Design a protein around this nucleic acid. Structure first.
Ligand SMILES: [K+]
Ligand SMILES: [K+]
Ligand SMILES: [K+]
Ligand SMILES: [Mg+2]
Ligand SMILES: [Mg+2]
Ligand SMILES: [Mg+2]
Ligand SMILES: [Mg+2]
Ligand SMILES: [Mg+2]
Ligand SMILES: [Mg+2]
Lengths: 121, 170, 94, 173, 306
RNA sequence: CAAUAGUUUAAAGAGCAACGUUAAUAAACCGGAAAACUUUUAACUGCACUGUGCAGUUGCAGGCAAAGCAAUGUUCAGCUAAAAAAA
């Protein structure tokens, strides 16, 4: 549950460190969670691939708010993080330092499921 | 020209307790909450009987669960190994190791929280119903000392010396 | 007090107290004690104590309303209360 | 019965803050023990009746833990001594209901309701209370039912020293 | 309330006799019908009778797929047919059902008189269900039990909601209010404007304002019947049901179901004939996969790549 | 309001709440008057009652117990005490 204009930490190796959400897609409601794609503005980057002031797409990977499962359980992280994506829908990096959860077992996240180090499933 | 009505019979001759499902140390009740109001020796409120009806149903489900599973009596501060099934991933089995930070004893709605830390990703918390069928086994493997709730909360916020196993097994 | 005083007056005149009916009652203005109380920003108000007269007339066999009140006994305290002699063995039977 | 509220404990607010509320109830409880009969408003009487019953329970306990709790409630040493010695032996067999409340109309000035709170077994009692232990007829359904449900039913007052303690003393001496 | 009574006048002697003869003729009725309890075919337009139940509370359970299901428990104490209506006397056909039990000395003589006259217990609640044909009438005294329903169907529930008391616009109607700071003065939770000026010059009817909230009749449609316990007269329904514990709830076959669905369920009609004591506890089976979205793309995704 | 999150120390498996759960895309749903019908010796307070009484005398959210704590058990408190003998 992240409202618009929230700050996120980048967990890929594309060079970006800090981003801010500036828009949503479709009709997700007043907040977005893990598995949704948003539009972000880069605030702090140290690299040649990306620079501060650009606008990119990203996917939410971790959040501090409870994530509920059909069996009645839920889990929580201690940070909010995302991964930058290209216009074709592929990551801009090749190494993700995050814990992948059940949301990414879906077929559309094959590339993330390959470059991620630790997986919960 | 006279029609005699039918008098119901007594289910348990010379037994004063119907034998409803209750915990061992609770004094036995003298009536069944689902019995019609007309056939009761004591006319107790429907509202109070409905509360007692739910308690009987809860105990019936708990008895069946205990016949299916046998878990240890763990406490807060113990390190546990929990075997679970991931319905999302084609019902595959995994084993999780973590610290128990909260335990609620509320009958059939009992639950607990499991805490663990990873090498780089940080802390991770799970809330697990105790009677959920997805859980297959629970075992105690160790203990972590703490002074009070404030000390335990500080430990959780500052991830440290909680990396028992770096990843999940199976 | 007025009701009792009027009945005593009726008996002296030779009327039966068991047939008396309240036939007329009204009030009348008395002499008032005037005063003043201050208000905010220098304004002032009135502070009056009022007084009234009461008149009651009782007559025999006058038209009366049918209202009647039920009467019950008060709480029984002392040797006249015998709730402690109840036998509670009967309620265990069918 | 005494109404239950939504605050911690379900007690009355007595139109006071919690600190002043506890100071008032402790003082009145001390006076009830000393005099055994008090006349006050209905709200203070209802709260005092429920509080008074729980104070007698501590006296019946007769333990070091119970005395410590009571020592913070009672205001006078003489009243505290009476609670554990005299009242403890008085209500050995009575299971609850050590205080009664009877309404007594309205006051004169503010027309507030009033009541009388009194102990339920003593000389000078307003009424005669039922015996602490109810006698059971020898040929009643009640006797048979109690045997089937509670074999340890008490039918007559028990002595201060039970037979087991008496037997032990006799063997010792 | 009612309007003041209208004046009445005696009839002329040349017309009084005629009026009385005609009025009596219209008020003369034939013998009461005698319904027979027998299974009947179900037709495209045929409504069944409902039942009166008591709300017990909420619990939860896990299904065959391991999913947690919230449940509401409804208890049927004693429901019987206590009267009939037919066209000759009332103009339409209906069945009257009663439930509960009360003591004779706690009700008005008018209420107790009806039940005593037919040798029935004094019942706390009474409700009417309209039927389609005279053959749908049930004999007086017939019991309506938990076997009246088929596990896995949909039902409708009606009742009175929980009383909340006198509540304001923010809680009663969800008004936004006014800011907490920036110069606001004693109007944080007030409704604001209630009209305009000289035109229209008044306040419209049913304008939303503070008032009492919480005791009103509401109906929930399309709830699922999860489990049935005929022996103990219990119904387990998924979802929320209006009213607090002990509220009286009316249960009916949902109008959201089509004729084909009712035929497939093979609902009892006019009602279940037999002894419900020797019946087992049944749980509905769902032939669906709650985790299908993890194997196939069925979820909502607004972005089209490339 | 079963579960999850927040909130009260004369505390809690309380109560109220949404950030939580269920349902709806309709001749469905809701409100008051009233014909007709039925019943009656034509009916009419009250459980501390400014939450609710779906509780009126083996009635009860008091007290008391080894008890899940507005539930189970119960001899006490208050409102409202009961019976022909014998055959
Ligand atoms: K106590
Ligand atoms: K309008
Ligand atoms: K509900
Ligand atoms: Mg001045
Ligand atoms: Mg606001
Ligand atoms: Mg100003
Ligand atoms: Mg202000
Ligand atoms: Mg509630
Ligand atoms: Mg209590």
């Amino acid at each position: 549950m992240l409202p618009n204009y929230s700050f996120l930490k980048v967990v890929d190796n594309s060079g970006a460190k800090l981003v801010k959400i500036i828009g949503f897609y479709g009709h997700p409601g007043k907040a977005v969670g893990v598995g949704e794609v948003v539009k972000v503005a880069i605030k702090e980057a140290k690299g040649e691939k990306v620079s501060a002031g650009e606008m990119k797409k990203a996917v939410i990977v971790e959040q501090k708010f409870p994530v509920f499962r059909p069996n009645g359980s839920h889990f929580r992280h201690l940070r909010n993080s995302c991964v930058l994506l290209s216009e074709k829908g592929q990551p801009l990096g090749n190494k993700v330092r995050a814990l992948l959860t059940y949301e990414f077992i879906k077929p559309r996240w094959s590339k993330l499921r390959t470059i991620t180090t630790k997986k919960l499933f | 020209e006279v029609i005699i009505p039918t008098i119901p019979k007594y289910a348990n001759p010379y037994k004063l307790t119907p034998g409803v499902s209750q915990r061992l140390r609770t004094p036995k009740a003298l009536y069944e909450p689902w019995c019609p109001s007309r056939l009761l020796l004591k006319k107790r409120n429907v509202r109070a009987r409905m509360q007692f009806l739910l308690d009987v149903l809860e105990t019936e489900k708990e008895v069946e669960f205990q016949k299916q599973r046998n878990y240890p009596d763990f406490k807060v501060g113990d390190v546990l190994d929990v075997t679970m099934v991931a319905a999302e991933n084609e019902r595959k089995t995994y084993v999780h190791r973590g610290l128990c930070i909260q335990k609620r004893d509320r009958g059939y709605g009992s639950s607990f929280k499991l805490y663990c830390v990873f090498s780089d990703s940080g802390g991770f918390i799970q809330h697990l119903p105790l009677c959920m069928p997805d859980i297959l086994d629970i075992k105690i493997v160790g203990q972590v000392d703490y002074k009070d709730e404030e000390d335990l909360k500080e430990l959780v916020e500052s991830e440290s010396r909680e990396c028992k196993f770096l990843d999940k097994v199976l | 007090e007025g009701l009792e005083h009027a009945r005593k007056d009726a008996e002296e005149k030779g009327l039966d107290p068991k047939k008396l009916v309240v036939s007329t009652v009204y009030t009348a203005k008395g002499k008032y004690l005037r005063g003043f109380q201050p208000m905010g920003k220098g304004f002032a108000g009135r502070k009056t104590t009022r007084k009234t007269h009461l008149r009651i007339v009782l007559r025999e066999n006058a038209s009366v309303l049918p209202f009647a009140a039920q009467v019950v006994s008060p709480s029984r305290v002392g040797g006249a209360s015998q709730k402690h002699l109840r036998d509670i063995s009967v309620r265990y039977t069918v | 019965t005494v109404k239950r509220f939504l605050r911690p404990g379900g007690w009355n607010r007595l139109n006071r803050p919690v600190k002043e509320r506890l100071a008032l109830i402790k003082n009145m409880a001390t006076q009830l023990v000393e005099k055994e009969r008090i006349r006050t408003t209905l709200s203070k009487a209802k709260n005092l009746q429920r509080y008074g019953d729980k104070l007698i329970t501590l006296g019946k306990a007769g333990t070091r833990e119970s005395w410590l709790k009571a020592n913070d409630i009672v205001r006078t040493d003489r009243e505290l001594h009476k609670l554990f010695t005299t009242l403890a032996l008085r209500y050995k067999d009575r299971q609850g209901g050590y205080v009664r409340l009877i309404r007594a109309g309205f006051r004169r000035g503010d027309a507030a309701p009033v009541a009388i709170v009194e102990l339920v077994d003593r000389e000078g009692e307003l009424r005669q209370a039922r015996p602490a232990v109810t006698p059971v007829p020898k040929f009643s359904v009640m006797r048979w039912v109690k045997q089937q449900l509670d074999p340890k039913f008490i039918s007559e007052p028990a002595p201060l020293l039970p037979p087991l303690v008496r037997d032990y003393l006799k063997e010792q001496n | 309330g009612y309007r003041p009574a209208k004046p009445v006048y005696p009839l002329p002697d040349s017309i009084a006799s005629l009026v009385e003869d005609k009025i009596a003729e219209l008020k003369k009725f034939g013998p009461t019908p005698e319904p027979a309890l027998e299974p009947l075919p179900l037709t495209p337009d045929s409504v069944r009778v409902g039942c009166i139940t008591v709300k017990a509370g909420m619990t939860h359970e896990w299904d065959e797929h391991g999913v947690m299901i919230p449940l509401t428990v409804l208890w049927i104490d004693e429901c019987q047919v206590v009267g009939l209506k037919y066209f000759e006397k009332n103009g339409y056909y209906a069945v009257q059902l009663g439930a509960g039990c009360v003591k004779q000395h706690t009700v008005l003589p008018q209420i107790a008189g009806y039940y005593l006259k037919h040798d029935l217990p004094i019942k706390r609640e009474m409700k009417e269900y309209q039927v389609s044909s005279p053959e749908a009438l049930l004999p007086v005294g017939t019991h309506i039990t938990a076997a009246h329903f088929v596990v896995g169907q949909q039902v409708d529930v009606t009742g009175y909601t929980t009383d909340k008391g006198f509540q304001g616009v923010m809680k009663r109607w969800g008004f936004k209010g006014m800011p907490a700071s920036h110069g606001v003065s004693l109007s944080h939770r007030k409704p604001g404007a209630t009209g305009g000026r000289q035109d229209p010059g008044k306040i419209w009817k049913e304008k939303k304002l503070p008032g009492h909230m919480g005791d009103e009749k509401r109906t929930q449609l399309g709830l699922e019947l999860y489990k049935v316990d005929p022996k103990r007269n219990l119904l387990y329904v998924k979802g929320a049901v209006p009213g607090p514990r002990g509220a009286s709830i009316l249960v009916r076959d949902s109008n959201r179901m089509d004729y084909e669905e009712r035929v497939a369920l093979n609902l009892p009609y006019p009602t279940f004939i037999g002894s419900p004591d020797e019946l087992p506890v049944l749980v509905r089976k769902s032939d669906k996969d709650p985790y299908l979205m993890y194997k196939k793309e069925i979820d909502y995704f607004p972005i089209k790549w490339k």
